[PDB]
Design a protein around this nucleic acid. Structure first.
Ligand code: MG
Ligand code: MG
Ligand code: MG
Ligand code: MG
Ligand code: MG
Ligand code: MG
Ligand code: MG
Ligand code: MG
Ligand code: MG
Ligand code: MG
Ligand code: MG
Ligand code: MG
Ligand code: MG
Ligand code: MG
Ligand code: MG
Ligand code: MG
Ligand code: MG
Ligand code: ZN
Lengths: 154, 51, 90, 120, 93, 134
RNA sequence: GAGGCAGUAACAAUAUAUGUAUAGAUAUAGACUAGGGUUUUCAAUUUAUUGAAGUGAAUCGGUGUUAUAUAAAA
RNA sequence: UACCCACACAUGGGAUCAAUAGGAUACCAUAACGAUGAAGGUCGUAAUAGAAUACGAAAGUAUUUACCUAAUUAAUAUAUUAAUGUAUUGAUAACCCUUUGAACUUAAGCAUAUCAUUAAAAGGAGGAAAAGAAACUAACUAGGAUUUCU
């Protein structure tokens, strides 16, 4: 029951969807979703399938220390790029669910646009490891919340 | 180890019985709606000390 | 070695159940309980101050002393067949 | 259900035939639990019937014992029928034995009894 | 040895019920044997004497067992043919 | 202060423990109700404990004025349900209301399980108390 | 309770257009005792969770004798 | 695009304030165990049962009381004629009566001294125990068993 930080001016023609505490790493889904805003919904699903088959890359901007250079990141005027698998499959499941509510409410699929995309941190899940000389160190992981809203064009 | 005395078998039978979750007929009651057992054990993690 | 290589050789068990106390502190070679000292009639004095808390009088069932306290406060109910008989004693 | 009053009516020989016939009733009820369904209050009423019936039997044999040892001293009767108070009281000596006194004392106090007098 | 005694041991005290498993049903037909559940404290000689008192059919040998759940089960061979099918039918199993 | 101790005390926590952990005849007398005026002329006492099936009338609260019959009694909660009263739920308003029996006065009795034997025993014991004083 | 260093060090990653098969690759294998105690078998739902079933002795071990005032599952 | 600042809205965590079937201290009453089997333990009993809690084959709401346990078909002694009867044995964690008995510490070091007629340890009883009717105190114009307070 995470609330949205989106301010809705028209209650009709706004579609929201949500996944809470997904089991994907936080720093990698933040890197993929930075360029999804102000796009058509049809261009987004075509773009995310090219990341899985390694034909388009993701430009690392915030957390980017130690990433290999490539030539596919010239489209963003960048010099770093990577292709995360598991982060793209979690975002693809959200965009299909938006497409199903549009045909149930009878809206037109081509006219939609992505408007509000934010993710945030989540409570941890703890773990363990056993190192040399008999010492024990933590081995925990960090999930995230995913929030996406779609709006029709004018 | 397939060669036990009388006391070792009688103690081992009782220790098997007490490792169980709450039955389903009790969980529908208002008292035990969300309560669950906390005293369960695992046979590989913790040992029983019976010898 | 003294460390990891010598902990494989520990597969012998020395202490077993006691009849009187129920703990696993009965030596099978020395033939004596390390907590209650079983073959002696008197029980062993405990080792510390906290050890007197763990098995004192009153943490048990008190199958008899619950009755004796209850006849102190309220009177004892008598059997009428037994009450008539005791008056016929010399 | 069964009342405790009906067991006190019957004979000693008639009390024994009921306990066996009640015990036969528990056998067919317990087999019904395995191979059929059993009502949710049916076994418990049958178990408590035998506990009430045995308690009348234990009382009827006891009144036979009282008529046999009716007038005897205390060291003749068995120890179970003796009155019990506590172990420290059974070793105490009686009130009659504690107040006995030497002839030099009780002869003296019989000459000078108590006086009731008034203010100073 | 006491003044007021307990009553005598009655054959309804030893036998509890009749096992109705799949392995027990194979032992009824092919081998004419009965699978009972008894109390834990009684031995082999008293179990066999009790079965010939209840159902009125002679029993020869009894093999006992203590399973892992704390019960005690007995495998009672019957002498005459057709006894175990008749007994389990009248008892309601 | 174990359970049902029935003390003479003035502390807040000592008196409230006797209200929760009461048992027996003490739990019955907490749930009593006031008599009508015409019923007071027949017997002469003030109040009496409550059984199932006698006609009562609410005299205080948001349900003031309504008259109904008693459907259930809950000893573990000190609450009762009166006919004709409705309470809102998340689906409907068909839930009957739950009231405390100190807010109700009953109009007509219900004679079951030796109820007339008990009422005549109290009316005998009351007038003997008046003869002691004069 | 939560940061930086940092998604950095350190570990895991066999082939087939149709397959309950055709191939490749690494590791000797199986029984009694000491220790473990339901991990056994099956069903349903995804090295997990719940529920049933399963250990049958006149001749296989203990219970017996002793090691110069408590000793043997070889 | 990254780095910095300002404002508005959402995550993360359980501080502040309010409550309370819990504790702490002082006073008053009681001061009831055990061979007629104690205190404590092991295993079992619920119509559908795991923890907790109550209860013994009469077993999850006025009698019964499974098996070990001083645990006893005994041991140390007395009485009657090898057998029978009687008395003792175990639990305590405050107060009471005996036995045995330290050191740390203080002396600005330390060895007599002090801590100390203490702590630990052992034996023996009761609701209280021990003490108690001058082979005394005094030097006065003489007092009067024991115990406790100033
Ligand atoms: Mg690098
Ligand atoms: Mg490592
Ligand atoms: Mg190690
Ligand atoms: Mg073993
Ligand atoms: Mg291990
Ligand atoms: Mg060795
Ligand atoms: Mg050794
Ligand atoms: Mg066998
Ligand atoms: Mg590698
Ligand atoms: Mg399994
Ligand atoms: Mg000091
Ligand atoms: Mg010094
Ligand atoms: Mg100094
Ligand atoms: Mg020095
Ligand atoms: Mg000294
Ligand atoms: Mg005194
Ligand atoms: Mg004295
Ligand atoms: Zn012991």
């Amino acid at each position: 029951a995470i609330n949205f930080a989106y301010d809705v001016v028209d209650p009709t023609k706004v579609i929201k969807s949500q996944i809470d505490s997904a089991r994907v790493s936080f720093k990698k889904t933040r890197e993929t979703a930075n360029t999804l805003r102000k796009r058509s919904l049809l261009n987004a699903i075509s773009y995310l399938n090219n990341v899985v088959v390694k034909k388009e890359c993701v430009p690392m901007r915030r957390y980017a220390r130690g990433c290999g250079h490539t030539r596919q990141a010239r489209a963003f005027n960048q010099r770093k790029g990577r292709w995360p698998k598991k982060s793209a499959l979690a975002l693809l499941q959200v965009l299909e669910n938006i497409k199903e509510q549009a045909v149930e409410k009878g809206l037109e699929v081509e006219k939609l646009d992505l408007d509000h995309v934010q993710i945030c941190r989540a409570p941890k899940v703890f773990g363990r490891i056993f190192r040399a000389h008999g010492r024990v160190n933590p081995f925990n992981k960090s999930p995230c919340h995913i929030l996406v809203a779609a709006k029709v064009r004018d | 180890g397939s060669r036990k005395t009388e006391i070792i078998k009688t103690r081992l039978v009782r220790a098997r019985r007490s490792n169980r979750a709450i039955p389903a007929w009790k969980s529908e009651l208002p008292e035990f709606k969300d309560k669950y057992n906390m005293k369960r054990r695992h046979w590989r993690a913790k040992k029983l000390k019976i010898y | 070695s003294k460390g990891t290589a010598s902990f494989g050789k520990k597969n012998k068990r020395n202490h077993t159940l006691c009849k009187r106390c129920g703990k696993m502190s009965y030596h099978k070679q020395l033939r004596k309980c390390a907590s209650c000292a079983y073959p002696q009639p008197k029980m062993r004095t405990p080792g510390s101050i906290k050890a007197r808390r763990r098995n004192a009088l009153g943490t048990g069932r008190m199958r008899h002393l619950k009755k004796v306290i209850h006849e102190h406060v309220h009177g004892k109910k008598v059997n009428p067949i037994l009450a008539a008989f005791w008056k016929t004693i010399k | 259900k069964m009342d405790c009053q009906s067991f006190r009516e019957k004979n000693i020989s008639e009390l024994e035939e009921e306990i066996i016939n009640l015990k036969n009733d528990l056998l067919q009820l317990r087999q019904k639990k395995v191979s059929s369904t059993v009502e949710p209050d049916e076994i418990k009423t049958a178990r408590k019937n035998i506990a009430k019936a045995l308690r009348v039997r234990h009382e009827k044999l006891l009144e036979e014992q009282c008529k046999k040892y009716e007038n005897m001293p205390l060291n003749k009767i068995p120890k179970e029928l003796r009155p019990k108070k506590t172990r420290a009281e059974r070793r105490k000596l009686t009130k009659k034995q504690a107040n006995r006194k030497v002839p030099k004392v009780w002869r003296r106090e019989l000459k000078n009894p108590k006086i009731y007098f008034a203010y100073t | 040895k006491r003044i007021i005694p307990k009553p005598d041991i009655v054959p309804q005290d030893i036998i509890k019920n009749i096992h109705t498993s799949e392995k027990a049903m194979r032992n009824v037909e092919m081998h004419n044997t009965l699978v009972l559940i008894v109390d834990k404290k009684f031995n082999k000689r008293q179990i066999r004497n009790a079965v010939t008192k209840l159902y009125g059919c002679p029993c020869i040998k009894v093999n006992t067992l203590i399973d892992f759940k704390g019960r005690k089960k007995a495998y009672a061979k019957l002498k005459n043919d057709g006894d175990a099918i008749k007994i389990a039918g009248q008892s309601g199993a | 202060m174990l359970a049902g101790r029935k003390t003479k005390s003035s502390l807040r926590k000592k008196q409230r423990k006797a209200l929760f952990t009461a048992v027996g005849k003490d739990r019955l007398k907490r749930m009593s109700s006031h008599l009508s005026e015409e019923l007071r002329s027949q017997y002469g006492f003030r109040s009496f404990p409550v059984a199932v099936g006698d006609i009562v009338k609410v005299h205080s609260g948001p349900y003031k004025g309504k008259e109904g019959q008693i459907l259930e009694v809950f000893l573990k909660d000190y609450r009762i349900t009166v006919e004709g009263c409705l309470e809102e739920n998340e689906e409907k308003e068909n839930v009957p209301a739950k009231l405390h029996p100190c807010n109700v006065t009953f109009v007509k009795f219900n004679m079951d399980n030796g109820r007339e034997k008990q009422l005549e025993e109290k009316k005998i014991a009351r007038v003997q108390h008046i003869e002691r004083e004069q």
